[PDB]
Amino acid sequence: PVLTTNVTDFNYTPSHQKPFLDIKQIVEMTLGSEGVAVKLPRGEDENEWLAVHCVDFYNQINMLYGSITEFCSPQTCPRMIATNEYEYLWAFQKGQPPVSVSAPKYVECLMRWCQDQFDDESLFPSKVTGTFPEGFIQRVIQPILRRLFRVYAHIYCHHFNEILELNLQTVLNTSFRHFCLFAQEFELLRPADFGPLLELVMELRD
Amino acid sequence: PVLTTNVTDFNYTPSHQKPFLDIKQIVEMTLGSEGVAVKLPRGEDENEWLAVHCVDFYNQINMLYGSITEFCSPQTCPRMIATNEYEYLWAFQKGQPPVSVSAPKYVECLMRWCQDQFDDESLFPSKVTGTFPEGFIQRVIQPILRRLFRVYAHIYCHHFNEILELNLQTVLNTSFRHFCLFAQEFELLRPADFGPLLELVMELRD
Ligand SMILES: [Zn+2]
Numbered sequence: 001p002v003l004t005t006n007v008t009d010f011n012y013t014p015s016h017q018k019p020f021l022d023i024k025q026i027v028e029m030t031l032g033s034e035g036v037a038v039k040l041p042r043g044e045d046e047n048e049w050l051a052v053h054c055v056d057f058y059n060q061i062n063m064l065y066g067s068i069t070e071f072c073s074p075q076t077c078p079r080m081i082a083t084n085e086y087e088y089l090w091a092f093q094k095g096q097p098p099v100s101v102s103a104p105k106y107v108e109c110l111m112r113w114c115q116d117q118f119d120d121e122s123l124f125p126s127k128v129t130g131t132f133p134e135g136f137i138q139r140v141i142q143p144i145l146r147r148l149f150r151v152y153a154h155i156y157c158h159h160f161n162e163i164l165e166l167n168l169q170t171v172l173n174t175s176f177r178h179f180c181l182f183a184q185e186f187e188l189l190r191p192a193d194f195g196p197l198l199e200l201v202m203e204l205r206d
Numbered sequence: 207p208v209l210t211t212n213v214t215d216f217n218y219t220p221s222h223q224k225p226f227l228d229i230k231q232i233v234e235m236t237l238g239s240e241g242v243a244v245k246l247p248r249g250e251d252e253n254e255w256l257a258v259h260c261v262d263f264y265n266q267i268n269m270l271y272g273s274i275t276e277f278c279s280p281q282t283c284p285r286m287i288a289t290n291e292y293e294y295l296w297a298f299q300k301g302q303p304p305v306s307v308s309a310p311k312y313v314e315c316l317m318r319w320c321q322d323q324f325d326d327e328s329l330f331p332s333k334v335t336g337t338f339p340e341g342f343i344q345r346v347i348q349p350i351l352r353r354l355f356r357v358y359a360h361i362y363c364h365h366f367n368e369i370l371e372l373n374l375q376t377v378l379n380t381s382f383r384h385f386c387l388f389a390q391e392f393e394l395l396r397p398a399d400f401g402p403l404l405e406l407v408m409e410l411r412d
């Protein structure tokens with residue numbers, strides 16, 4: 001949930017997942033940085049296609065957070081924010097009210113939660129002989145995409161300078177563009193799910 | 207030195223450094239992947255320019271190894287190799303003969319050794335009022351560049367598929383190209399220092 005208005009032990013720890021098979025200033029920096037597979041194939045299963053890409057998107061965000069993880073600590077980022085207009089909250093026990101947490105605690109919990117869904121055989125069948133549950137796209141895929149977006153939002157609004165230092169602007173913008181086009185093709189994310197990055201999506205998408 | 211012919215605890219650990227201030231198959235995969243600041247500025251000090259870029263190159267290699275580190279363990283890569291024609295060795299105590307070690311042990315030792323040179327005030331002055339030692343370029347910069355190259359060699363020859371999975375082919379090729387052009391401009395590396403990547407350098411450089 002969304003609230004709209006030298007210690008290293010507690011930074012985000014990356015983990016790769018095995019394959020399934022103000023805002024105006026921020027956006028101008030993003031576009032200026034550049035100067036320095038979406039459709040379901042015919043005969044292919046939609047759930048499988050969406051499952052494949054959901055694990056792939058997790059892995060791109062894992063690689064991108066991992067590149068800057070030493071710059072995001074509970075002292076640099078005491079709240080999970082995407083500018084001062086958006087704060088994102090985490091519920092530690094399911095069905096309980098979400099709370100304010102530092103950005104790396106948030107990212108850690110969220111990413112480990114995604115891996116727990118990928119690793120759950122009743123959600124993501126790990127054999128050819130398994131099936132997907134009813135409501136898979138709405139009940140599993142959509143919540144995962146909505147949450148992974150919040151990680152992109154924190155990176156762009158609070159760590160873009162570091163991404164630029166490492167020359168990862170094009171990899172970041174390419175991943176995000178593919179994430180947003182994929183969500184559009186299947187109506188997984190709507191304009192409101194983009195929060196502070198709406199203009200970015202308007203520019204990058206096309 | 208050069209010899210020419212589920213446990214996770216022992217993979218390479220990344221650490222960012224604060225800013226100073228067969229082979230034919232491998233090369234064709236590299237070029238096909240693409241379809242899916244060098245001169246000293248006027249009035250500027252050469253030692254400073256080379257010191258700045260040496261820490262920057264370390265940081266690009268750190269980010270690139272970090273992206274694939276879970277795929278390089280003492281079981282996947284029991285020797286530090288760049289194809290079966292080149293094995294690179296590490297001396298654990300200075301002045302002693304270098305030995306065979308696993309790739310991630312090698313990379314760990316080498317990168318931590320680079321940081322120890324960057325952090326040594328008598329080599330890399332950490333204030334405006336320090337000076338560089340005599341022989342800086344030959345005795346400090348050149349050995350560091352020669353060693354960092356061996357890390358690029360292992361990545362290209364043994365982990366390129368994983369770099370491709372993460373869409374980092376262009377970032378890898380861009381870093382390596384800039385590394386090789388920088389070495390050419392100042393004669394830091396010679397054609398022999400490139401070992402198995404000579405053809406790659408021939409294609410990428412220009
Ligand atoms: Zn942060």
Ligand SMILES: [Zn+2]
Nearest residue numbers: 278283309364
């Ligand atoms: Zn390896």
